[PDB]
Amino acid sequence: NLLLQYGSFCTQLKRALTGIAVEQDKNTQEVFAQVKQIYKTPPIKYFGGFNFSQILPDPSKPSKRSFIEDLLFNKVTLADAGFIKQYGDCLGDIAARDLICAQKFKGLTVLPPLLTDEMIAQYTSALLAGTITSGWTFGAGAALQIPFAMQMAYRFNGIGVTQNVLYENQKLIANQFNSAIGKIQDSLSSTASALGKLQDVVNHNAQALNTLVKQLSSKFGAISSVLNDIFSRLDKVEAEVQIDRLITGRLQSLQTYVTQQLIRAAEIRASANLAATKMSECVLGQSKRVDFCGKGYH
Amino acid sequence: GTNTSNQVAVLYQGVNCTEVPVAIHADQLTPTWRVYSTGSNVFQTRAGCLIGAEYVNNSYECDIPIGAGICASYQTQTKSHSQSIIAYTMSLGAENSVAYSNNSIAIPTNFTISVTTEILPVSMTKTSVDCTMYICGDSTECSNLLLQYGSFCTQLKRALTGIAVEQDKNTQEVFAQVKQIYKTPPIKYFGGFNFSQILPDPSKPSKRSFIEDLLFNKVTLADAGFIKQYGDCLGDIAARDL
Amino acid sequence: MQMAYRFNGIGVTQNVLYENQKLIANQFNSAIGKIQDSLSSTASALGKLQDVVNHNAQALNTLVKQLSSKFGAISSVLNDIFSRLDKVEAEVQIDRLITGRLQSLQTYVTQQLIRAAEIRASANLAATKMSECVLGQSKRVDFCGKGYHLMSFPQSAPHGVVFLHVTYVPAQEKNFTTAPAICHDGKAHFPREGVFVSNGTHWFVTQRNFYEPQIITTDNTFVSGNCDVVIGIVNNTVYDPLQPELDS
Amino acid sequence: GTHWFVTQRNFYEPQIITTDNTFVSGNCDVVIGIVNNTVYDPLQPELDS
Numbered sequence: 001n002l003l004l005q006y007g008s009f010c011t012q013l014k015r016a017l018t019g020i021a022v023e024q025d026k027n028t029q030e031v032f033a034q035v036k037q038i039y040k041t042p043p044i045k046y047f048g049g050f051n052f053s054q055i056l057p058d059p060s061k062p063s064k065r066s067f068i069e070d071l072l073f074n075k076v077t078l079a080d081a082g083f084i085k086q087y088g089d090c091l092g093d094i095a096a097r098d099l100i101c102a103q104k105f106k107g108l109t110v111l112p113p114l115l116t117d118e119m120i121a122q123y124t125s126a127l128l129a130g131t132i133t134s135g136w137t138f139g140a141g142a143a144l145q146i147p148f149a150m151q152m153a154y155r156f157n158g159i160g161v162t163q164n165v166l167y168e169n170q171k172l173i174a175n176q177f178n179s180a181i182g183k184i185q186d187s188l189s190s191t192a193s194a195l196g197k198l199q200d201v202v203n204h205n206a207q208a209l210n211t212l213v214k215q216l217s218s219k220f221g222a223i224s225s226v227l228n229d230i231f232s233r234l235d236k237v238e239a240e241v242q243i244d245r246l247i248t249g250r251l252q253s254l255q256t257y258v259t260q261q262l263i264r265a266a267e268i269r270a271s272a273n274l275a276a277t278k279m280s281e282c283v284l285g286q287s288k289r290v291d292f293c294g295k296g297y298h
Numbered sequence: 299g300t301n302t303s304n305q306v307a308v309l310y311q312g313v314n315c316t317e318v319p320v321a322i323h324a325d326q327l328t329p330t331w332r333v334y335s336t337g338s339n340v341f342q343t344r345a346g347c348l349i350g351a352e353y354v355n356n357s358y359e360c361d362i363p364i365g366a367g368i369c370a371s372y373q374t375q376t377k378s379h380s381q382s383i384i385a386y387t388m389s390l391g392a393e394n395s396v397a398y399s400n401n402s403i404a405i406p407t408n409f410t411i412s413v414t415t416e417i418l419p420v421s422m423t424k425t426s427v428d429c430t431m432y433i434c435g436d437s438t439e440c441s442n443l444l445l446q447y448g449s450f451c452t453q454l455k456r457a458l459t460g461i462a463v464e465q466d467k468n469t470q471e472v473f474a475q476v477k478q479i480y481k482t483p484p485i486k487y488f489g490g491f492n493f494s495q496i497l498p499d500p501s502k503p504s505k506r507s508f509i510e511d512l513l514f515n516k517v518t519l520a521d522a523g524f525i526k527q528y529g530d531c532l533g534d535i536a537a538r539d540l
Numbered sequence: 541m542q543m544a545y546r547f548n549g550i551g552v553t554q555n556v557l558y559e560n561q562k563l564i565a566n567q568f569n570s571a572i573g574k575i576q577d578s579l580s581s582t583a584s585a586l587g588k589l590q591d592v593v594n595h596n597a598q599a600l601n602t603l604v605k606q607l608s609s610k611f612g613a614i615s616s617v618l619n620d621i622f623s624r625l626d627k628v629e630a631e632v633q634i635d636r637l638i639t640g641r642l643q644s645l646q647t648y649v650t651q652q653l654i655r656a657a658e659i660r661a662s663a664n665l666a667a668t669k670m671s672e673c674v675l676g677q678s679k680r681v682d683f684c685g686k687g688y689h690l691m692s693f694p695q696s697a698p699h700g701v702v703f704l705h706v707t708y709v710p711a712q713e714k715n716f717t718t719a720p721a722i723c724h725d726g727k728a729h730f731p732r733e734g735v736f737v738s739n740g741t742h743w744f745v746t747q748r749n750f751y752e753p754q755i756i757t758t759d760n761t762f763v764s765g766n767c768d769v770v771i772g773i774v775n776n777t778v779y780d781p782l783q784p785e786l787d788s
Numbered sequence: 789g790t791h792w793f794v795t796q797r798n799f800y801e802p803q804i805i806t807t808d809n810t811f812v813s814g815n816c817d818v819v820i821g822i823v824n825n826t827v828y829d830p831l832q833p834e835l836d837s
């Protein structure tokens with residue numbers, strides 16, 4: 001009843017966070033959902049001597065992710081952070097704080113994403129199958145099948161090297177590609193700090209919520225941070241002026257959290273637009289821009 | 299939409315569907331609330347319990363995004379006729395398989411010309427705030443107290459002025475890329491191509507094209523009162539404009 | 541001639557335009573008519589600009605409603621605090637109102653700054669699309685429409701710009717048997733600006749984006765050595781155009 | 789150091805300098821740093837056969 005005198009602050013904070021939550025799904029739809037049809041790889045995996053077994057999906061896993069995608073998911077130590085269940089377990093006999101149930105008890109929930117990781121893996125599988133079996137032709141319209149050796153001849157003719165270099169050195173190029181994929185596997189199985197960019201995205205969103213939870217113990221100049229103690233120990237003449245400080249401080253902390261989330265959402269949206277550009281121009285085609293996709297001639 | 303129907307599904311986030319009448323204290327609630335926890339048409343999504351939507355094994359495009367791959371839609375042809383809210387797992391797209399072979403290629407024998415539309419915002423509305431009139435509103439003692447609070451109003455007006463200059467800079471950067479105003483020859487024949495729908499029309503008072511007229515009619519831009527509004531605001535009218 | 545240049549930009553020979561000019565003009569006019577029908581029938585496609593209106597009308601209305609809040613004071617009407625209370629108590633009650641209204645106005649300014657940054661990013665993208673696709677022909681994939689880009693036309697719009705991207709999309713596919721090279725007289729022959737294709741028995745060389753079969757000669761093929769190194773090489777005859785001149 | 793060839797830029801592959809891979813533009817006076825070498829003609833021994 002005291003909070004109703006303030007009014008439309010809570011509604012616009014809810015609208016801002018709802019806009020951010022819709023924008024995350026929009027970013028994930030923009031980056032991955034670029035292909036119209038879910039292509040699948042042929043059952044025979046002889047692509048001109050090139051070995052794609054470590055990036056193509058693995059049917060042995062329950063979730064159809066590749067080997068390198070499994071390493072990438074294992075290196076990021078993402079916590080629970082909601083996204084599944086997280087109620088009833090808090091009512092259950094864990095008998096611990098758990099750092100997530102306290103936010104759920106305090107009105108701070110975490111919504112799950114619209115696209116699950118199986119569906120993102122199916123998008124990446126479709127993009128990989130289209131790139132392998134059709135080159136850039138599936139980005140401009142219907143997919144046109146082409147052998148991978150002549151696709152590599154197209155890729156060499158793009159960068160200014162005649163295609164006779166490829167057909168005289170095809171086995172050596174295939175061996176170098178397989179060695180580079182093996183070096184990627186050796187790089188991802190030892191250094192867990194390579195994926196620090198995504199770990200910062202996890203850590204900032206955990207840390208801001210922990211700060212917002214821990215800010216409720218502050219008094220903001222009042223006699224107590226406990227809400228019921230001011231009501232019980234004082235009458236209505238000065239309890240309202242003591243709890244107005246608490247309401248002002250908590251509302252200002254909520255506004256600070258929403259402002260920082262808006263700035264971080266703008267930064268994440270810029271990075272997602274860059275990722276969508278790199279998917280459109282380098283996966284679905286060949287890029288002539290210098291240092292846009294890897295050092296050297298792309 | 300309430301223009302269509304009043305039927306509503308309810309999502310309890312994170313809650314087990316058996317714990318739904320425990321999570322909300324539905325004994326104390328009205329019987330109109332009790333039909334949205336009764337156990338009749340209840341599904342458990344990864345986000346929690348969804349009550350009032352019928353799960354369908356088909357897959358469609360996402361109409362109303364619930365979450366975790368689950369979407370919902372108001373379907374007309376559900377059951378015998380009986381329009382109702384259905385829930386499903388959203389469909390990624392049509393399934394395809396490229397016929398790869400080591401000596402087979404596919405070459406097009408024809409083409410088509412596609413003209414598509416891309417829409418981009420450029421500038422927004424330039425606003426200005428009188429801080430003394432907003433805070434006090436014709437109160438002299440309030441202004442005398444507000445003078446003690448420092449230079450907040452000056453930096454707020456500075457920020458709004460910077461935004462208002464930036465909008466004009468955005469419009470100048472986007473549209474004024476050419477130094478000379480070229481015009482077409484009076485004979486509008488270009489290789490058999492037709493540009494009569496994008497070239498300017500001198501019949502209109504504002505020399506815009508047909509498609510530009512459609513784009514200006516489609517967006518319901520408010521007049522925003524930057525053209526001589528106060529003569530209207532003086533006159534007492536029954537419909538107070540915003 | 542301009543559209544022939546735009547076809548040579550995307551890797552199609554220019555005569556493909558000159559033998560099919562009327563069909564391309566008819567397809568362009570039909571697509572322009574379909575754009576007019578799509579804009580006259582559906583209004584939600586302009587929604588990206590409509591929110592630009594709405595966010596500048598929803599916020600200000602919100603800024604009106606914050607004058608109804610008391611912020612812990614006895615009244616939201618400012619003159620009643622002066623006319624009902626003594627001066628010290630009036631200043632105590634009006635400090636809360638001044639602080640609350642100042643905080644609400646600062647919140648509005650911060651939201652306007654963030655929205656202005658987003659609009660500036662969109663305007664920079666629109667200026668890039670005006671520079672690269674209207675004033676030239678872009679080779680970037682999916683930057684200006686799906687397919688191989690030919691032209692773009694700008695149109696103004698309320699608080700924004702609308703690009704009509706004219707692009708080329710291949711339509712009617714056909715299977716062919718192919719080979720990387722043809723080893724004739726012990727010499728491997730590679731195509732210059734085409735691919736080797738076959739229809740059962742005869743081998744031709746085509747451009748990649750359009751089916752135009754041609755007789756494989758020495759003008760459109762080059763020799764890089766013996767056929768042992770190449771994998772998938774086949775045997776055929778490469779015609780010499782200078783050979784009938786050797787008979788005379 | 790002995791003979792002159794023409795290659796592609798991004799990979800070493802020497803070829804005999806003929807009229808098929810070179811083009812003619814003007815005289816020898818204006819270009820700075822020009823050298824002397826014999827440009828082979830393939831059609832001349834074929835016509836004399």
Ligand SMILES: *[C@@H]1O[C@H](CO)[C@@H](O[C@@H]2O[C@H](CO)[C@@H](O[C@@H]3O[C@H](CO[C@H]4O[C@H](CO)[C@@H](O)[C@H](O)[C@@H]4O)[C@@H](O)[C@H](O[C@H]4O[C@H](CO)[C@@H](O)[C@H](O)[C@@H]4O)[C@@H]3O)[C@H](O)[C@H]2NC(C)=O)[C@H](O)[C@H]1NC(C)=O
Pocket residue numbers: 407408409410563566567712
């Ligand atoms: C590459 O692709 C382009 C387009 O993608 C093709 O160009 C079209 O080709 C078709 C068929 O060759 C043409 O269609 C023909 O159009 C004639 C005139 O159509 C006008 O008039 C009729 C009424 O009479 C209208 O309904 C119509 O909308 C047009 O306004 C028709 O008279 C033809 O009909 C005859 O054939 C059909 C079967 O196709 C029979 O059913 C009929 O009874 C009749 O005998 C026919 O429909 C079309 O005009 C071409 N242009 C365009 C812009 O679409 C290229 O042919 C293609 N190239 C290759 C090599 O495949």
Ligand SMILES: *[C@@H]1O[C@H](CO)[C@@H](O[C@@H]2O[C@H](CO)[C@@H](O[C@@H]3O[C@H](CO)[C@@H](O)[C@H](O[C@H]4O[C@H](CO)[C@@H](O)[C@H](O)[C@@H]4O)[C@@H]3O)[C@H](O)[C@H]2NC(C)=O)[C@H](O)[C@H]1NC(C)=O
Pocket residue numbers: 490491492493494
């Ligand atoms: C390039 O495209 C333009 C636009 O399609 C085309 O110009 C002509 O545009 C007008 C409208 O801008 C089209 O409409 C007709 O205009 C004539 C003018 O004499 C009228 O007589 C027509 O009226 C008939 O149809 C009405 C439909 O409601 C009836 O109510 C009426 O009684 C008449 O029956 C009609 O309004 C006109 O069709 C086009 N012209 C053509 C040939 O399509 C221009 O010609 C195109 N240029 C090229 C090179 O393709």
Ligand SMILES: *[C@@H]1O[C@H](CO)[C@@H](O[C@@H]2O[C@H](CO)[C@@H](O[C@@H]3O[C@H](CO)[C@@H](O)[C@H](O)[C@@H]3O)[C@H](O)[C@H]2NC(C)=O)[C@H](O)[C@H]1NC(C)=O
Pocket residue numbers: 396397398713714715
């Ligand atoms: C070019 O050649 C390829 C391979 O020869 C053709 O692809 C194959 O086309 C056939 C006939 O359409 C497909 O068979 C059908 O498949 C569908 C979907 O599974 C099935 O429902 C039908 O009952 C029928 O069996 C076949 O799947 C397809 N792919 C393969 C790998 O064989 C292609 O159509 C040819 N294209 C042209 C333009 O000639």
Ligand SMILES: *[C@@H]1O[C@H](CO)[C@@H](O[C@@H]2O[C@H](CO)[C@@H](O)[C@H](O)[C@H]2NC(C)=O)[C@H](O)[C@H]1NC(C)=O
Pocket residue numbers: 051052053054
């Ligand atoms: C492609 O690479 C994978 C490994 O990246 C190869 O799989 C290995 O095959 C050897 C065969 O002697 C086994 O000993 C390994 O245990 C396999 N490793 C894994 C991870 O499965 C595969 O053989 C390669 N394919 C080709 C065609 O060379």
Ligand SMILES: *[C@@H]1O[C@H](CO)[C@@H](O)[C@H](O)[C@H]1NC(C)=O
Pocket residue numbers: 085314315316342343344
């Ligand atoms: C609650 O839901 C989870 C799935 O989200 C399920 O694993 C669990 O068994 C459910 N608990 C009960 C008591 O039904």
Ligand SMILES: *[C@@H]1O[C@H](CO)[C@@H](O)[C@H](O)[C@H]1NC(C)=O
Pocket residue numbers: 353354355
């Ligand atoms: C969907 O499929 C499952 C398993 O086949 C079945 O139990 C369920 O009744 C089906 N639901 C509908 C609406 O068909």
Ligand SMILES: *[C@@H]1O[C@H](CO)[C@@H](O)[C@H](O)[C@H]1NC(C)=O
Pocket residue numbers: 044046400401
């Ligand atoms: C090409 O594919 C066919 C079909 O599987 C196979 O028999 C043949 O051995 C392949 N060619 C090479 C060089 O592997």
Ligand SMILES: *[C@@H]1O[C@H](CO)[C@@H](O)[C@H](O)[C@H]1NC(C)=O
Pocket residue numbers: 483485486487488
């Ligand atoms: C070009 O030729 C067409 C007829 O082919 C004629 O109508 C037109 O007036 C000529 N001039 C121009 C500038 O289009």
Ligand SMILES: *[C@@H]1O[C@H](CO)[C@@H](O)[C@H](O)[C@H]1NC(C)=O
Pocket residue numbers: 526527528529530
């Ligand atoms: C302001 O005065 C000008 C001068 O005649 C007039 O044209 C205009 O309509 C007036 N505006 C209003 C709102 O009365």
Ligand SMILES: *[C@@H]1O[C@H](CO)[C@@H](O)[C@H](O)[C@H]1NC(C)=O
Pocket residue numbers: 739740741742753
């Ligand atoms: C292949 O196409 C050429 C070009 O017209 C034709 O002369 C030849 O007969 C065709 N071969 C077969 C087997 O159809």
Ligand SMILES: *[C@@H]1O[C@H](CO)[C@@H](O)[C@H](O)[C@H]1NC(C)=O
Pocket residue numbers: 773774775
């Ligand atoms: C092509 O000709 C050579 C030389 O006669 C022969 O050795 C070879 O088997 C032939 N066939 C091929 C390369 O398919």
Ligand SMILES: *[C@@H]1O[C@H](CO)[C@@H](O)[C@H](O)[C@H]1NC(C)=O
Pocket residue numbers: 822823824
């Ligand atoms: C090339 O030959 C001409 C004519 O014999 C001579 O004048 C010139 O000096 C020569 N240049 C070089 C670099 O040998």
